[PDB]
Amino acid sequence: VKIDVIRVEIPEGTNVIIGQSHFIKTVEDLYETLASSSPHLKFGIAFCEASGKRLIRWDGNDEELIKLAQQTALKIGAGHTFVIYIKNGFPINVLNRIKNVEEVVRIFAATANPLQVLVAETDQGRGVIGVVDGYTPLGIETEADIKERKELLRKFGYKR
Amino acid sequence: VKIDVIRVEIPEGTNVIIGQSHFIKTVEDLYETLASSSPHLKFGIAFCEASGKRLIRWDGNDEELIKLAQQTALKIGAGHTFVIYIKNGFPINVLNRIKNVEEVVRIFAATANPLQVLVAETDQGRGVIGVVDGYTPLGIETEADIKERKELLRKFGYKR
Amino acid sequence: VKIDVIRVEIPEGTNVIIGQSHFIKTVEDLYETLASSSPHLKFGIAFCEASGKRLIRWDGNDEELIKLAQQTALKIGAGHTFVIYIKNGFPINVLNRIKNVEEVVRIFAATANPLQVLVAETDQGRGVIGVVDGYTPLGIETEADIKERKELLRKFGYKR
């Protein structure tokens, strides 16, 4: 089987979340859970209908993010894949909501780092076999590094 | 590393859910959560014990669905893989219950579309690297399309 | 694309849990949920920071398990991969907690069986495409086998 490496565009200030789902109700459910997560979250959603007209189904409240979602979904081109781009918010704000959508099967990635999606192609179609999120590890953090990452979260206001 | 493309049989009227789990308790836990999801759901469960006797463990309340699960589990042949076939009900009815089963590690697919499971084989055994769920996208839906899918969900009573 | 077969070391009496996450807060959150899951659970955590200094971030309450986690994370070498080793406890005790951590994207495996992590190589770095958990199935269990596994769970005390 052939394996393609797909580069996912991630404009500055955005985060992308890519996963797998089923049933066209995926779109409205994702739209709804994201809209009720915060009044200021900006998002775009794309879902690959795997049968029938096989159309990229979409929705959201930000056209720029919607178009980015449609593009990435097309590049991947794997049936039942869904893509979400968000701005003015972070993946941790909505990751659990997404995992909890009844249509959602799994999530492949949630990141803002350079991202590649690995796609296998067969005689039937395309399927996601994984992703390359960011770079490989260079070393083990020290006590000084630990102190620094702890101060970071406290500075951002995530932890006390 | 060799890669095999496994064809999953999905008879008309049924849906298949394939994932990964651990521990023998997987079977009874899956049986229990499906049984208490509805008094009319019909289901069959297969689990690939990956050590000891390495036997396909199974249960369910429908003989034919059990056989389908057994067959598909054998064809994938990857340790700790679980397969569920359901009828007279849909994946969205039980997908969240399955995600919440303490043994379940992840889910690979939930669909009724033609499905292929991608299996990598090594010196040790077999592992699932992904699936080809349905077909590739043929375009982007229009406003007209959007209006129709909305009516679709309302006609079937999923949304108002 | 090149696929590496990475052997994961699993000391006796321990279980390894490998997944994918995002954001440094992953370490603090995993540590916390494991710490508040049981007063006797022993654990080690490693997270592959995929940007900046690209350091293996870690924490835990058992130096041995921590080192194992760091080593395994390095061996896999895929950005944003997290590795957890637990002792004096079982995966079913904490698998749901891990799935519910807002940073966690997905889980690749939770087991004590011989484990191989399949890693895809690209010009950007490494990514996990799957795992080989244990061995392939040898056959289908019988009615007698079903009675035995049911009795086994009663003996352990998981079911009545």
Side-chain angles (χ1 to χ4, degrees), chain B residues 87-98:
Chain B
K87 199 193 12 158
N88 197 35
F90 305 108
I92 58 175
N93 295 336
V94 300
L95 208 47
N96 282 339
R97 283 175 169 252
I98 295 169

Side-chain angles (χ1 to χ4, degrees), chain A residues 24 56 59 73 95 103 126 155:
Chain A
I24 192 167
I56 295 294
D59 206 336
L95 229 234
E103 274 96 10
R126 297 161 67 82
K155 184 181 184 303

Side-chain angles (χ1 to χ4, degrees), chain A residues 39-58:
Chain A
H40 304 99
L41 178 68
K42 296 306 174 186
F43 59 91
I45 307 165
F47 173 67
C48 296
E49 169 174 32
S51 67
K53 300 182 173 182
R54 297 158 54 171
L55 299 171
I56 295 294
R57 307 298 188 149
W58 54 276

